[PDB]
Structures are given as C-alpha cells and as structure tokens.
Write an enzyme that holds these catalytic residues in place. Structure first.
Site, PDB file in Angstrom:
ATOM      1  CG  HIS A  58      -7.148   6.463   4.698  1.00 59.25           C
ATOM      2  ND1 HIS A  58      -7.167   6.553   6.015  1.00 59.25           N
ATOM      3  CD2 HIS A  58      -7.118   5.347   4.256  1.00 59.25           C
ATOM      4  CE1 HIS A  58      -6.862   5.290   6.447  1.00 59.25           C
ATOM      5  NE2 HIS A  58      -7.170   4.456   5.458  1.00 59.25           N
ATOM      6  N   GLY A 116      -9.921   1.938   8.678  1.00 59.80           N
ATOM      7  CA  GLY A 116     -11.277   2.110   9.178  1.00 59.80           C
ATOM      8  C   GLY A 116     -11.877   1.315  10.121  1.00 59.80           C
TER       9      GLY A 116
HETATM   10  C1  LIG Z   1      -8.160  -8.538  -2.108  1.00 62.88           C
HETATM   11  O1  LIG Z   1      -8.470  -7.226  -1.558  1.00 62.88           O
HETATM   12  C2  LIG Z   1      -6.960  -6.547  -1.134  1.00 62.88           C
HETATM   13  O2  LIG Z   1      -6.025  -7.173  -1.399  1.00 62.88           O
HETATM   14  N1  LIG Z   1      -7.399  -5.241  -0.804  1.00 62.88           N
HETATM   15  C3  LIG Z   1      -6.892  -4.307  -0.043  1.00 62.88           C
HETATM   16  C4  LIG Z   1      -5.372  -4.687   0.180  1.00 62.88           C
HETATM   17  C5  LIG Z   1      -4.704  -3.545   0.762  1.00 62.88           C
HETATM   18  C6  LIG Z   1      -5.260  -2.280   0.923  1.00 62.88           C
HETATM   19  C7  LIG Z   1      -6.708  -1.996   0.731  1.00 62.88           C
HETATM   20  C8  LIG Z   1      -7.371  -3.039  -0.039  1.00 62.88           C
HETATM   21  N2  LIG Z   1      -7.166  -0.881   0.793  1.00 62.88           N
HETATM   22  C9  LIG Z   1      -6.930   0.409   0.075  1.00 62.88           C
HETATM   23  C10 LIG Z   1      -7.217   0.087  -1.416  1.00 62.88           C
HETATM   24  O3  LIG Z   1      -8.134  -0.597  -1.850  1.00 62.88           O
HETATM   25  O4  LIG Z   1      -6.356   0.658  -2.382  1.00 62.88           O
HETATM   26  C11 LIG Z   1      -6.675   0.550  -3.623  1.00 62.88           C
HETATM   27  C12 LIG Z   1      -7.491   1.685   0.476  1.00 62.88           C
HETATM   28  C13 LIG Z   1      -6.882   2.212   1.795  1.00 62.88           C
HETATM   29  C14 LIG Z   1      -5.419   2.889   1.874  1.00 62.88           C
HETATM   30  C15 LIG Z   1      -4.539   2.894   3.145  1.00 62.88           C
HETATM   31  C16 LIG Z   1      -4.521   1.551   4.139  1.00 62.88           C
HETATM   32  N3  LIG Z   1      -4.064   1.620   5.382  1.00 62.88           N
HETATM   33  C17 LIG Z   1      -4.173   0.754   6.019  1.00 62.88           C
HETATM   34  O5  LIG Z   1      -5.158  -0.227   5.990  1.00 62.88           O
HETATM   35  C18 LIG Z   1      -3.455   0.553   7.383  1.00 62.88           C
HETATM   36  C19 LIG Z   1      -2.301   1.392   7.965  1.00 62.88           C
HETATM   37  C20 LIG Z   1      -1.703   1.519   8.912  1.00 62.88           C
HETATM   38  C21 LIG Z   1      -2.599   1.854  10.287  1.00 62.88           C
HETATM   39  C22 LIG Z   1      -1.871   1.670  11.575  1.00 62.88           C
HETATM   40 CL1  LIG Z   1      -2.898   2.119  12.830  1.00 62.88          CL
HETATM   41  C23 LIG Z   1      -0.629   1.291  11.565  1.00 62.88           C
HETATM   42  C24 LIG Z   1       0.054   1.059  10.406  1.00 62.88           C
HETATM   43  C25 LIG Z   1      -0.347   1.226   9.333  1.00 62.88           C
HETATM   44  N4  LIG Z   1       0.295   0.713   8.001  1.00 62.88           N
HETATM   45  C26 LIG Z   1       1.602   1.399   7.550  1.00 62.88           C
HETATM   46  N5  LIG Z   1       1.605   0.971   6.480  1.00 62.88           N
HETATM   47  N6  LIG Z   1       0.862  -0.157   6.287  1.00 62.88           N
HETATM   48  N7  LIG Z   1       0.050  -0.127   7.296  1.00 62.88           N
HETATM   49  C27 LIG Z   1      -4.326   0.299   3.029  1.00 62.88           C
HETATM   50  N8  LIG Z   1      -3.244   0.421   2.352  1.00 62.88           N
HETATM   51  C28 LIG Z   1      -3.391  -0.904   1.621  1.00 62.88           C
HETATM   52  C29 LIG Z   1      -4.554  -1.187   1.693  1.00 62.88           C
HETATM   53  N9  LIG Z   1      -5.045  -0.522   2.940  1.00 62.88           N
END
Ligand SMILES: COC(=O)Nc1ccc2c(c1)N[C@@H](C(=O)OC)CCCC[C@H](NC(=O)/C=C/c1cc(Cl)ccc1-n1cnnn1)c1ncc-2[nH]1
Length: 238
Positions: A44, A189
């Site tokens: 993902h 990840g």
């Molecule tokens: C300054 O840098 C920055 O702020 N970077 C940055 C910030 C936030 C992100 C992210 C990058 N990653 C996503 C992205 O870049 O989206 C554009 C991709 C990836 C998209 C999905 C990711 N899911 C998780 O990471 C985990 C979820 C999860 C897992 C478990 Cl086991 C339990 C509860 C969970 N949650 C439920 N709701 N939230 N968590 C995510 N969502 C926002 C992000 N990642």
C-alpha cells in the site's frame, strides 16, 4: 507508534525509513532489511508511486534529523508488489524493494530472519512494533524511532474485533484488549519483530487498523510466515 518509547541506536538494525522525493522529500513508510539488496515492506506504500526513481532507502537511522541532502541512502532498482494485492484491508499487503547497491552489514544495519515454515506452530510472546509514525491519529512523523511491545492476537479474536472484514490467516493481529499501544500513521511497511529462542524474526509487516490503539481494535499485519515462498521466489529467482 502509540504508547511507545524511544528506541536506542542499533536496537532494530533491520528497520529502515523509506523516503519519497515527490513532490519534496519526506518519510513515506517503514521497511525491513531481509537480504543485502532486499527491503520487505507494505504494497500500500506505493499507491501513486509511478517510478522507483523517487524512492530513497535509509538504513542505520535512529533519528530522522540524521537525514539531510549529504546523508547516504540506497537507491531502488525495482518495486515488486504481490500481484494479488488490491488493498491493505484485503491482504497480500507485501512488497519487496530491490536496491541498486548492496547493504554493507554492521552493528548499525543488518537483516532480520524471516520466520521458519516450522515456526508456524510457535507462540511468540515477545513482539515489538517499531516506527517513526504518529503517537495519535492527528500528529506528525516522530524524529526518534519508537518501539512498543504488543501481544499477538488469535485470528478468531481478531475476526470478532473486525465485523465486516474478512481477517484471513495471511493476516496476523496484535494489540491489547484495552488498546493503548499500537502502530499509527507513518508506521506502515515496518516490522512486527518477535524474539524466539534468542533470535529475532520478522513475524509481521504493519498494514492497517481501525484508528490507532483503540480498545478492541488490534493492529493488522501481513503474516510474513505465509509469504516465505513468495519472498524466496522473488529474491532467489534464477
Ligand atoms: C513529513 O513526512 C510525513 O509526514 N510523511 C507521512 C505521514 C503520514 C503517512 C505517510 C507519510 N505515508 C503515506 C503517504 O505518504 O501518503 C501520502 C502512505 C501510506 C498510507 C497508509 C499509512 N498507514 C500507516 O502508516 C498505518 C496504519 C495502521 C496500522 C496498524 Cl497495524 C494499526 C493502525 C493503523 N492506523 C489506522 N489509522 N492510522 N493508522 C499511513 N497513513 C498516513 C501515513 N501513512
């Protein structure tokens, strides 16, 4: 990570921070070193990632502040996504990154063992989820790598907690009935690492959950043992 504490440098030497260069550079996901040119992460993470050319893998990092323009990283040659993957909630949330260069192993960066097919019959009692993700649903990427010890949950119990989803044996769940300790945004990840007979094993890949650290909502992880043959297929290709 919710309800975690700061890690110590070198504590999780297989943990990497995967950054994206588009539109500007930022942390994208977590990942695990599994071989000298292989990172194991979540499929993902690559939603809308059109090319591996925008990706930067950083190993040996405790703090995000160690990353500046002069910090060395590993380039990505190839993104390998499980071809049954549709979405995190449906499973197959697994990807491999083939690095352009070889990781030099040391006390700062080394691989985590994959679980054994024989270890499918084992109960892990010492599992930790790590990452630079949020401490709460509305937060920011953390500077220091966090850790949290979380108990594994049976498939049966996890299915009870997620009415409306199909929790398969290709998923593994972890969390406290009362909530409080979990992965959160930015942790995906990354590894769910379990110590068994003094050896650390990559039991899960942080995938999804309903909110973060909520009561009766365990974190859902890709059950790595169920993908060992898939990883070997991709990494040991003739
Ligand atoms: C300054 O840098 C920055 O702020 N970077 C940055 C910030 C936030 C992100 C992210 C990058 N990653 C996503 C992205 O870049 O989206 C554009 C991709 C990836 C998209 C999905 C990711 N899911 C998780 O990471 C985990 C979820 C999860 C897992 C478990 Cl086991 C339990 C509860 C969970 N949650 C439920 N709701 N939230 N968590 C995510 N969502 C926002 C992000 N990642």
């Amino acid at each position: 990570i919710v309800g975690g504490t700061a890690s110590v440098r070198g504590e999780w030497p297989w943990q990497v921070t995967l950054h994206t260069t588009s539109p500007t550079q930022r942390h994208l996901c977590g990942g695990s070193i599994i071989g000298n040119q292989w990172i194991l992460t979540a499929a993902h993470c690559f939603y809308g990632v059109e090319s591996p050319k925008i990706l930067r893998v950083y190993s040996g990092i405790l703090n995000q502040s160690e990353i500046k323009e002069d910090t060395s990283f590993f380039g990505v040659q190839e993104i390998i996504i499980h071809d049954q993957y549709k979405m995190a909630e449906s499973g197959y949330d697994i990807a491999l990154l083939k690095l352009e260069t070889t990781v030099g192993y040391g006390d700062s960066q080394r691989p985590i063992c994959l679980p054994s097919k024989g270890d499918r019959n084992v109960i892990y009692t010492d599992c930790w989820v790590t990452g630079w993700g949020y401490r709460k649903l509305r937060d920011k990427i953390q500077n220091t790598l966090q850790k949290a010890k979380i108990p594994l949950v049976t498939n049966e119990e996890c299915q009870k907690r997620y009415r409306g989803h199909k929790i398969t044996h290709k998923m593994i769940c972890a969390g406290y009935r009362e909530g409080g300790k979990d992965a959160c945004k930015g942790d995906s990840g990354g590894p769910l690492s379990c110590k068994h007979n003094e050896v650390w094993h990559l039991v899960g890949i942080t995938s999804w959950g309903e909110g973060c650290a909520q009561r009766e909502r365990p974190g859902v992880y890709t059950n790595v043992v169920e993908y060992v043959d898939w990883i070997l297929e991709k990494t040991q290709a003739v």
